[PDB]
Amino acid sequence: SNKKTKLIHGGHTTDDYTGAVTTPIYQTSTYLQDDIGDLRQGYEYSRTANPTRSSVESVIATLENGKHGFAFSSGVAAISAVVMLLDKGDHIILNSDVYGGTARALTKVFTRFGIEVDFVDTTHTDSIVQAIRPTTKMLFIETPSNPLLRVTDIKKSAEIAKEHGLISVVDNTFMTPYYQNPLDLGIDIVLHSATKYLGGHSDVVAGLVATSDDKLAERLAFISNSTGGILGPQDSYLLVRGIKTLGLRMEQINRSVIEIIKMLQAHPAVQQVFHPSIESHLNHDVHMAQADGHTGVIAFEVKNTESAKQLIKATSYYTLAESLGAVESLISVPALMTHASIPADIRAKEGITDGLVRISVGIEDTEDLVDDLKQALDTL
Amino acid sequence: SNKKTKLIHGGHTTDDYTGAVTTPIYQTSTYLQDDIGDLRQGYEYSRTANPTRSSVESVIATLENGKHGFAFSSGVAAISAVVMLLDKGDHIILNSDVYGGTARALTKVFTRFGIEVDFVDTTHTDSIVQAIRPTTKMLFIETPSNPLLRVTDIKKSAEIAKEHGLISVVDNTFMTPYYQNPLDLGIDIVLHSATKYLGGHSDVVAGLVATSDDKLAERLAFISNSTGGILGPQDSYLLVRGIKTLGLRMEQINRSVIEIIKMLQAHPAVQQVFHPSIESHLNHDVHMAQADGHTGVIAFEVKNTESAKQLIKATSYYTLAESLGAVESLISVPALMTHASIPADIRAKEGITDGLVRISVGIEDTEDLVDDLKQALDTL
Amino acid sequence: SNKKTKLIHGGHTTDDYTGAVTTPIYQTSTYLQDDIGDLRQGYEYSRTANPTRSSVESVIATLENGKHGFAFSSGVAAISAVVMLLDKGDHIILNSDVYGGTARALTKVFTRFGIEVDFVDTTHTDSIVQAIRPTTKMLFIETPSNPLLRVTDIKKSAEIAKEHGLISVVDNTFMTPYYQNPLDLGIDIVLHSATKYLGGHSDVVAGLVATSDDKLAERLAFISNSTGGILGPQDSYLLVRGIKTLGLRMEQINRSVIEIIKMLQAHPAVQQVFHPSIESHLNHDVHMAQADGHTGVIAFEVKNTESAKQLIKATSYYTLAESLGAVESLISVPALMTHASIPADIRAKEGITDGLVRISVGIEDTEDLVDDLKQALDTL
Amino acid sequence: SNKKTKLIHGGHTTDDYTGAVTTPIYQTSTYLQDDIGDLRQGYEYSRTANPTRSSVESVIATLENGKHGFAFSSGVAAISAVVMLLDKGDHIILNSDVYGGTARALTKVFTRFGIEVDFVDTTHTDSIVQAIRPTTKMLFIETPSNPLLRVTDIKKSAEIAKEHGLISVVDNTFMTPYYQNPLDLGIDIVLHSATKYLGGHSDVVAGLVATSDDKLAERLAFISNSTGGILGPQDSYLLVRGIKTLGLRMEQINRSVIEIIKMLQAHPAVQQVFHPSIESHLNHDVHMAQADGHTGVIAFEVKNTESAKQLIKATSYYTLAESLGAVESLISVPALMTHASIPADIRAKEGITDGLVRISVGIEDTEDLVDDLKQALDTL
Ligand SMILES: Cc1oc(Cn2ccc3ccc(Br)cc32)cc1C(=O)O
Ligand SMILES: Cc1oc(Cn2ccc3ccc(Br)cc32)cc1C(=O)O
Ligand SMILES: Cc1oc(Cn2ccc3ccc(Br)cc32)cc1C(=O)O
Ligand SMILES: Cc1oc(Cn2ccc3ccc(Br)cc32)cc1C(=O)O
Ligand SMILES: *Cc1c(COP(=O)(O)O)cnc(C)c1O
Ligand SMILES: *Cc1c(COP(=O)(O)O)cnc(C)c1O
Ligand SMILES: *Cc1c(COP(=O)(O)O)cnc(C)c1O
Ligand SMILES: *Cc1c(COP(=O)(O)O)cnc(C)c1O
Ligand SMILES: C[As](C)(=O)[O-]
Ligand SMILES: C[As](C)(=O)[O-]
Ligand SMILES: C[As](C)(=O)[O-]
Ligand SMILES: C[As](C)(=O)[O-]
Ligand SMILES: C[As](C)(=O)[O-]
Ligand SMILES: C[As](C)(=O)[O-]
Ligand SMILES: C[As](C)(=O)[O-]
Ligand SMILES: C[As](C)(=O)[O-]
Ligand code: NA
Ligand code: NA
Ligand code: NA
Ligand code: NA
Ligand code: NA
Ligand code: NA
Ligand code: NA
Ligand code: NA
Prior knowledge:
homotetramer; pyridoxal phosphate (chains A, B, C, D); binds sodium ion; cystathionine gamma-lyase activity (chains A, B, C, D); alpha/beta; Aspartate Aminotransferase, domain 1; binds cacodylate ion; Aspartate Aminotransferase, domain 2; binds pyridoxal-5'-phosphate; 15 helices; 2 domains; 39% helix; five-stranded mixed beta sheet
């Protein structure tokens, strides 16, 4: 029924055999056959399929309202598997501020295999229409993006991809299936870095992919079985377990996000704030029309590098570390940590200023997170 | 010093911090930074590096006398990472009877990216010399191969690859680092399905890669970090643990292999036997010159499909299942299980007859394994 | 600061060595000593102490505002360790409806060792005063109790125990440290079946004990080290992980508890409802004075056994299984499942009627849980 | 059939449901019931029974030729459960040099519950006959003992216990079921610290108990369920896995033991050597009659404390740490590490001299272990 119930009872996460109310961990590579080719429960070799991995795959398929799920050893392994649907000579359109790892994979790995990449400002979907070439075969969008939280119209992108014969892909990491369901809006494939919110506890690196398309699912299963970037059973189990509390965690994060943004907008040491909940944010209405909540990632400007470092040192409850979607709130400075290879003039032009801070809001007490960040900003 | 000591004390598999005599399992995705960019022990994000994965990587680098190790989510993920060293238009030479998963990856995935594949009978290394094109960039060999255990001269292949500017790769799964060390013979990259002997307990799917080449190691690390087929920490731990007993397991397996082959050669219901220890086997002397023991995989012919099925049903201690390198002995029929897509006339021509049985010798009592297989053959 | 922040940042649950933001899993039994008796970080043998177990022990000590924590292989192992503080000839007072496993341990095991047990209705603390003998050395109370949720005044029991030289113990399982902190009210020892709410995911069996008393802590450490009922490192890790979401889970459970009780009180097929939040419940004011929330366990009467079974069959979201404190709501019938050895006339006299149903409210959507239980009751 | 086969195929260590060739890890606390009291596969609550724990219990029952197995959270938890078969006023006879943890549990814990303990030199079984009181109910022996490896006649002790109505218990840790099977010699209960050889990899703390007596098994199951010192599922799995290689490990250890003892007996810096394989060792013939191999624990005298410390520092392959039965060889000095609370004059009288060194032989290369210990002794 409602989302919080679906999180507990959706998918197959119990043991039909013993009745165990949690998915058994099949730390196993192979399976007895009673006769040659007769598999007791459909399993024959864990790379091809493993029951614990099948459990988490059923969960992500259910949560995204798809038919088929796939679990990979990381988010970028899921992305690479999806890109491998294409052939040399094919063209893929991506949002222009796509995740750094995605941009690296496409421009430094897959370009050597003849895949051509164009980065497009998809906040206006007619940019996609202009960028389509005869060889374009895939449209890949994140929304909202990192670290400036740009929003792209999912439904319109799905329609464009249908009309032009493209495979449409949404990286739904920042929103999670709790708030945004791209397959319901016509997208062919949805994927996640489960390393972030889905696992939720900073203790699994994993990717998840869901689709309703039987033929794309067959192709993805073949790619998974042949290139072998599969998630192991212990990590699959920890994913199932972490997803149980996804709804509670996201709701707490959202309460804190709302109060923190109020504080940041009022504070004199903060300039611009980036988050899709802000009414003046580009495509705010598009976001509200395709999602019923918010990501916990916020970016905001302080004056300079020194202020950013001082802010980090002055907080008690914000942890300096890579990644996002933890139960701990995390803080980072993109210009120094993720975007430092880009020359400073280009960073400035793109809005990645020296004082741009990114926080990933965790599940600490809302008042504590607001007060801590405020007093730290007061030290500037 | 000696191999069995190196297996226990080689690599870094203790905790410098607490002194724990086993590698801690770092079920974690990210790491506190004390200042922006200052990593306490070199860790910042588990996809890039994880201490438990670094432990197993140090083990495989030590065991293969290399400098750099890499742990992947499966053997075929390690193979795919190594193939991704190449660009569209490049050509790779493989032994003609390479592992089915390798052939599938190259001919159904990487060929779509412009990688060209030629299958060559490398049991005569001058076949490699003939097959080299101007665009050839990699030579990839298994020895001994599956399921007919063909042997390829590693040292000569390394010399050919050096002379012609090729990256040389040996899939050393069947022999393990306990018996065969391709990097010592001049090969650039050695890799393993750790799913088999290294893990040894049929409970991990994993790949391992080792090299002494700093530049190839940098390229492999970039590919791993960008396409993300990494081994998780629990599986890395179980690998380290299983490798501890590699020497004992391989030695027991070898004692049983010798006695089983004597029995098979004497038995009237068995025709041809395939194993590199047999003096009339092609390149037996090459094998003995590049290895100081034997794989536990043996293939032998009984009369037909019905005899093969009857043999399997009549054994007590041979388990019908996919994979090899378990503590249990495993039995299979390639024509029905791994090679069934090849038309029967082609199978027959290649020696994959309907009665070809493959066994992977485990660590059961030698007398029991000999007697069990013999009495089962007596029922034919 | 506030409880939800303390749950994330309280205790020591990161790695000082690598900075890993989660507690490493020390799957290890022993530790290198650099010189005889010089321990690198205080560890020498995992039965005595293990770093992952020390992490969860620090968490429970912090959450209960104690100084010392202890992790056991189950709730009843924690209880047995605490009972072993006593000697033959000593007397222990327990609430008269104590948990079945506790009653079994004391009356069928520890009584054979000369420990004498008296069951007392502690809802009136003067019953404790009457029951005190010269040999009484321990007062052990649960509040609220199972399955009728009787409430005992913790502060008054602590004062009585101080005055008469008794060790006071509270089994705080049903309330958790999120809502009730017995050590703050003067109790010597607090303990939990961490199998329930603390782990929270029905995937760990564990006990936890906390105290502020240095001498009792030394005695408990000696008992743990000598009788060895220690929690293992994987289970310790899963406990730390599950406790992260304790606050969110308990708050969702409490919202659902309030709405479900409204529904049950209004429903014509339900007679008596047992829960400390009900204003006419005995010692409701005592509960509100010593706790700032509620347990998720509720008991209520339907007409008879047949109605109870029908109710269970008619629900969609209530799972028939033993235990409580899961993310799934659980349903049971004490007269058939936990109390069936008591003769029916005694059960009836005690209020354990054939139609008494117990539910443990999970974290499903509140509206779904209310509507599901209501429609199922409507089928009666 | 033969022991090495039984180690692989004995007990139930596969999944009947999927065919997985390894025991699934049931990280779970409770189990769905299809109707009240109808358990799908006999499971209802993991403290009472867990399928992974049942797997390791079946293994130890099979390996010891018993009917019932029990897995505890440590060796001393298994011992405490067995002692709890007794009542206040009962008397237990133990060998006089029993393991320190056992002596501590009995003389500092169970004596407070009215259990009376007598330490007896059981190397002459008539000492047992003299020590029997009207209240004696249990005879508990280790053989060989620590650290002087005293041997006790198991068959004669079993006969004495039968004749006088005692429960007989053998702590079979040092010999393992691979070499010594006390239940076959008439003993009622056999137990192990599985922390040592059975797990074999220094990564599990665990106890195991086996019996053929249905009534004692029922009593032990009740004690386990009521006091809750159960082994968790991950540790149970690692035990099953480690036991697979028990035979190979013990055989390698025995080859090394034989060569090391030759070296120690010849070396001028070594005085007395303690090991049951030495022909002049007390009850050498008794040991050879009740076992068909040897423990890997050896003790030997060097001159003094300074020589012992120097020896430890001079070795390359002997690791200074507590415990025994690892894949690494371990070295210790009992007078400083396990027996330091005993006054020095008593230690000297008992043979625990300042220069007594204990080694636990691991599975390193035999020549390496001999040569390393010899060169280190040469530095004296
Ligand atoms: C290493 C990296 O490469 C890219 C892609 N990329 C290439 C040029 C370029 C200019 C601006 C921006 Br924004 C992204 C750009 C993003 C990242 C990252 O880690 O964030
Ligand atoms: C699915 C598969 O594809 C191949 C490669 N391949 C293609 C044609 C062909 C002919 C003979 C042999 Br031998 C191998 C061949 C091997 C396998 C396998 O699973 O074994
Ligand atoms: C097996 C069990 O033993 C007890 C204790 N006990 C002994 C007599 C008795 C009468 C009423 C009540 Br209420 C509890 C009683 C509780 C339980 C249980 O599992 O619930
Ligand atoms: C702490 C400990 O207590 C004991 C039992 N115990 C009591 C007196 C005594 C004298 C000699 C010997 Br030998 C053992 C003795 C053994 C150990 C141990 O850790 O080894
Ligand atoms: C309600 C419910 C669903 C249906 O979810 P939708 O969001 O309507 O697609 C699926 N699974 C479970 C367990 C549910 O309770
Ligand atoms: C002997 C030894 C080595 C060296 O091994 P080689 O086979 O000579 O390369 C490495 N590590 C350890 C722990 C050793 O004992
Ligand atoms: C606030 C806070 C505490 C103090 O908790 P109290 O309930 O006041 O005892 C402890 N630890 C952390 C991490 C906190 O944030
Ligand atoms: C041989 C065998 C047994 C019997 O072992 P004994 O030592 O004769 O009691 C049990 N299980 C398996 C799997 C065996 O192979
Ligand atoms: C500006 As539009 C609504 O075509 O993305
Ligand atoms: C910013 As990242 C998830 O590539 O460490
Ligand atoms: C036949 As040749 C020795 O050139 O591989
Ligand atoms: C023969 As296989 C390791 O691809 O199941
Ligand atoms: C009735 As009273 C307040 O002495 O527990
Ligand atoms: C009611 As119970 C936790 O002893 O199964
Ligand atoms: C000396 As005797 C054989 O009675 O133990
Ligand atoms: C000698 As010990 C196993 O009690 O650390
Ligand atoms: Na738009
Ligand atoms: Na669609
Ligand atoms: Na050749
Ligand atoms: Na080289
Ligand atoms: Na009262
Ligand atoms: Na106090
Ligand atoms: Na004797
Ligand atoms: Na018997």
